[PDB]
């Protein structure tokens, strides 16, 4: 069997992963209060422009590429269009 | 491109999120020990009739709208049909 | 409103769940440092051949059957092809 480590960088206690129809992978980087994504084949993550996250701990992405995050430290759910 | 906050009422320590093909958003809630959902365009959530949960954590939804939840404290996975 | 408890066995503090097209359900069995899946029909529980996981806490599955896990304890995200 083969498992592959994805080239995210500087993750801290990550918690939550989603993958869209394009194979882009989204991760709630819980310990760094941010959400990062990696397109299929890409070597470098991008940080999603959410605002004021605290201990985010879950992520989902819909068919339109809208990203939903459980912003746990703030007791709320936020979403960001593609 | 600015984030929006979803109108869940009384959310306390969300643990996970999923979104179906219709854009309905499902969230697991630690403090209230329950799972809630919000249709796209709605600002009144519904509480899903799971019972005997001890901290729902993960949530997923399939193409048939069946909702799956990891019941963390009871070491089990429960589902409800649409 | 009847909920169904799936025939997973031996879970410990499960905290992430995903479901694929074949109706296969994947769970991050966090307390056992593993990811399990349940095949529809036969209800054969199989442990996915990830290795070196530590307190995993998020799982996702793409349209190709590739499984993605946030390996929280190791600050990384790992994937496994079908």
Nearest chain A residue to C28 by CA distance is: A16
Give the method used. X-ray
Exposure string over C49-75, b if 16+ CB within 10 A, otherwise e: ebeebebbbbbbbbeeebbbbbbbebb
- Strands B25-29 and B34-38, sheet pairing: antiparallel
CA distance A77 to C9: 32
Interface touch C81/A27, C-beta < 8 Å: no
How many cross-chain Cβ pairs, A to B, lie less than 8 Å apart?
67
Question: Under 8 Å CB-to-CB from C41, ≥6 apart: which residues?
Answer: none
Question: Do you know the residue count of chain A?
Answer: 82
Strand order across the C67-71 sheet: A3-5, C76-80, C67-71, C58-61
Residue with tokens 């359900």: C25
Query: Touching A: which chains, 3+ CB pairs < 8 A?
Result: B, C
DSSP code for A70: E
Residue A49's CB: how many other CB atoms inside 10 A? Answer: 11
Nearest chain A residue to B11 by CA distance is: A75
Residue C6, token pair as written in the block = 């799936």
Identify whether the C-beta of residue A52 lies closer than 8 Å to the C-beta of residue A37: no
d(CA C59, nearest CA chain A) in Å: 6
Interface touch B14/A62, C-beta < 8 Å: no
10 Å CB burial of residue B78 (0-12, 13-18, 19+) is: buried
CA distance C14 to B70: 6
Whole-angstrom CA distances from C70 to A6, B2, B26, B80, C18 are 10, 26, 20, 26, 13
Enumerate domains of chain B plus CATH numbers: 1-82 (2.40.10.500)
* Helix%, strand%, coil% for chain C, nearest 5: 5, 40, 55
Interface touch B14/A63, C-beta < 8 Å: no
CA distance A2 to A50: 34
Identify whether the C-beta of residue B62 lies closer than 8 Å to the C-beta of residue B74: no
Interface touch C17/B77, C-beta < 8 Å: yes
- Strands C4-5 and C17-19, sheet pairing: unpaired
Interface touch B3/A50, C-beta < 8 Å: yes
Question: Under 8 Å CB-to-CB from B21, ≥6 apart: which residues?
Answer: A63, B63
Residue C45, token pair as written in the block = 């529980």
Residue with tokens 């909920």: C3
Q: Residue C20's closest CA among C57, C80, C67, C56?
A: C67
Q: 3-class SS at A36? A: strand
Q: Find which of B13, B51, B72, B78 to mutate to test the C interface (most C CBs within 10 Å of its CB).
A: B72
Give the closest of B4, B13, B14 to A79, CB-based.
B4
Q: 3-class SS at C8? A: coil
CA count, 13 A, side-chain hemisphere, C6: 34
CA distance A9 to A19: 18
CA distance A64 to C43: 33
d(CA B68, nearest CA chain C) in Å: 7
Query: Touching C: which chains, 3+ CB pairs < 8 A?
Result: A, B
Identify whether the C-beta of residue A55 lies closer than 8 Å to the C-beta of residue A69: no
Identify whether the C-beta of residue A77 lies closer than 8 Å to the C-beta of residue B6: yes
Residue C18, token pair as written in the block = 């995903």
Nearest chain B residue to C25 by CA distance is: B68
DSSP code for C33: T
Interface touch C77/A23, C-beta < 8 Å: no
């Amino acid at each position: 069997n083969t498992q592959t480590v994805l080239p995210f960088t500087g993750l801290n206690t990550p918690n939550g992963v989603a993958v869209d129809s394009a194979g882009t992978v989204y991760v709630t980087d819980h310990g760094n209060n941010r959400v990062v994504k990696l397109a299929a084949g890409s070597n470098t993550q991008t940080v999603l422009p959410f605002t004021g996250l605290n201990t985010p701990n879950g992520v989902a992405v819909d068919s339109a590429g809208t990203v939903y995050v459980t912003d746990h430290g703030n007791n709320r759910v936020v979403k960001l269009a593609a």
